[PDB]
Amino acid sequence: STGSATTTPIDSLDDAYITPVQIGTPAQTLNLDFDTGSSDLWVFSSETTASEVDGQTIYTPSKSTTAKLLSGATWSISYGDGSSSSGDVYTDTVSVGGLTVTGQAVESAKKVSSSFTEDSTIDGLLGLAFSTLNTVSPTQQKTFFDNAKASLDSPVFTADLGYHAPGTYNFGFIDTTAYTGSITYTAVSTKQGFWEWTSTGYAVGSGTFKSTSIDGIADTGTTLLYLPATVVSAYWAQVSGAKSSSSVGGYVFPCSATLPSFTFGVGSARIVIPGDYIDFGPISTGSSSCFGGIQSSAGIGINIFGDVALKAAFVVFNGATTPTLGFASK
Template identity: 55%
Template sequence: MQPSFGSFLVTVLSASMAAGSVIPSTNANPGSFEIKRSANKAFTGRNGPLALARTYAKYGVEVPKTLVDAIQLVKSIQLAKRDSATVTATPDHDDIEYLVPVKIGTPPQTLNLDFDTGSSDLWVFSSDVDPTSSQGHDIYTPSKSTSSKKLEGASWNITYGDRSSSSGDVYHDIVSVGNLTVKSQAVESARNVSAQFTQGNNDGLVGLAFSSINTVKPTPQKTWYDNIVGSLDSPVFVADLRHDTPGSYHFGSIPSEASKAFYAPIDNSKGFWQFSTSSNISGQFNAVADTGTTLLLASDDLVKAYYAKVQGARVNVFLGGYVFNCTTQLPDFTFTVGEGNITVPGTLINYSEAGNGQCFGGIQPSGGLPFAIFGDIALKAAYVIFDSGNKQVGWAQKK
């Protein structure tokens, strides 16, 4: 993922996969493993407008000022609830509350990172960031790692649709996730960060999209997954995201619970896990499976058709998206994967409280993007298989 723009770190940049990237050394025959996400203790509750703005920024859609204002409005509502002596605010557990511990360097420095299938950079807060900007974050200190080696002449610079940015240097270092170690992984070490990044509670992310959209210049680097995939029993990983519990990622094998998945071929020409689908309220369209996005974003027509089934649902211009009465029971959302169907329960689509008895929907307009974004609202309904070997995605409905 990640409660700020810092959770969604990479705007899509056009980059070609360059030859000559360092070939990493990995430990022998790790086979497959599962890594569980851990709770982010700094989580303070869901903010619907913020989740929507993050995704717009990530994919280069201009963030309207009204949406920026709405973020602060919802934050003020949440603060008022926490300060009240008569109303108790119990933050919902959510995808943005969970992170993955990752060890970097020798001796290992542990940072809590978000796994993001919608980007391709391993980005971290570092000791080069001004201490006032990195406060509250665990940081990577290259000088304290005996295995760290600076990649001279390499840099990265991420810019969002709202013109916030982050940039820095690149190191090669040991990176361990679970029981698997890559001995020469590109680690993008932040030097400058915008305020939106510093407000997050995660320490960076691990991009799991395709290496073709890695942002390092002059030579794009391989993702951590691309570096270890040859050592796995099978070239796959599975996202098992959960509601009200951390969930996990499986690398190198498919858990038995996901054995009855439906599959669809992917188009990775833009670097994403993109597949063709259709829904029970719309025709054929393309969608990107993105663990680094919270909401489900789709075309205006599809979103309008969905909320036409919800009595009293409307676009709230102050909150920047569709809202409805919190007592309303939302309909399910069903979409196709290959020859099968996956259903997102309506309970998952009621994303967050927005004040005055209104709730913010987990399905929102995509801002004119040429594809839908199936974020965690959709992903939590299924085991999602990212199969790079067969260039396909699989979805297995959760019961």
């Protein structure tokens, strides 16, 4: 089997991407944030504290003839941005782009933190990291991908995120028309439960490539590119007037600037992030200070190849017995 679904930016800045997901019988379609940095499929629901729901579409398990309470199971998750959610668990039928999994754990939120409430466009998350990070207790549950894997034509999914435009998540096949040149594959460590890999270096604009190993994670659920302070300083030094602002919470730059590109290495291959992908617009409405899309990972504890990086590539998440990651230009 295969599946193919379009993923759509939630706003004009590509702060996140939503993908429609069918849950239950008859189908209830929710727009979920596909997140290769976590492993829980959780939804706003009829059980979510009413004051914490503000415009989201909810899953109502009592209206699904295939929903079953997973007795005694609870979940609770905290994300790198400080947001969180928790609740109980149902199993139900879940379909993505024509690919159907029966008996998928659908984690129903009883509580969500303010940032989720405040984002009306995201009805929940669909985790695509390794199932070892799933938070369901006392019986850990599998991701949608893990459940689908054996039925797939090939045990892979691909992320093709757009810049200010829709893109695609495919399951079970590689669309050879969706990228240019060849796909370069690179080793993955699953030791921390992430799609963790080592970039071979970077360049700023038309500058020379610096060969240096940068361990980090391919994370579709993080907006920006978080890299070591040395790398980030070298990037922003090429933008007149750019500075790190403790009050704003990162590097800012004059909105009048033209940003240089940023290249990262995948083996001997190179992925070029155009300068415009690095512009996240005014820090506040009407400001001439703009927020940068490359930020320091210092104090996160891990480097994160988030959407800024991933949307410059066609990315293969290869879930073979030994997982790997592939990157192509597009």
